[PDB]
């Protein structure tokens, strides 16, 4: 048995992540391995228990599924992911956070401003922004379904209810410069973005969901500094071992 062999990025597609701090490639998963990855996060938003987050009834998300569900733990090995979170990272890479956000139609709120390193930094003692996240469609994402939305190049600056959202002034002056950008994509897409890159996000105002898997990898050598780490293991992982791919076998 046979897996592809890995794909990495092109130089063009690399220097665009890293001039505007995301990527969308289109249809990375088709739609049965998404159907899988949907009824494994129905599972694990039925099952996650302190793991679950809520609308303040409806289960919104879920953390730290890697860990305790088989399907994800081999999602984050996929030769669909692995390969191209190890090339821009440019080392071997481990999962810091996993998480499924659902915004489900008619519903969803607002995500302030925010960059994901300034919580990691502190939270948890990431030393530098050297980490991604991969946020896998599990729908289609368009203007109408609360999709992410970012500063352009905004995370070249660096590091500037969330804990740390992002003021109105400094804001204001990020995006007169650099603009504001939703990326769209079919479900399957893979929508990479950097530890630093600000984003935001408004509620679904369609009749359609808005499932998101978002895998946060980081460098090995950007390992946390778990003597200043605050949180439990399925919010940040302890666990630094080099991830491998996913091989093709009989079961
Ligand atoms: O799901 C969303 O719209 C926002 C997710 C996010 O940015 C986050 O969890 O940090
Ligand atoms: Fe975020």
Redesign the pocket.
Known sequence: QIMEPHDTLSPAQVDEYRKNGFLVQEHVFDEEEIELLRAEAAQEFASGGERVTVEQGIVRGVHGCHLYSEVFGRLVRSPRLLPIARQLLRDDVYVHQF?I?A?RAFKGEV?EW?Q?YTFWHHEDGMPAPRALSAAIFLDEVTEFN?P?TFVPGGHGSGMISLKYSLDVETMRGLIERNGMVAPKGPRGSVLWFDANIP?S?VPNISPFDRG?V?ITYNSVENKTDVTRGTRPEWLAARDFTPLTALQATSF
């Open positions: 998480k956000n915004k995500w925010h994901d609360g992410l984003h996000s998101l978002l």
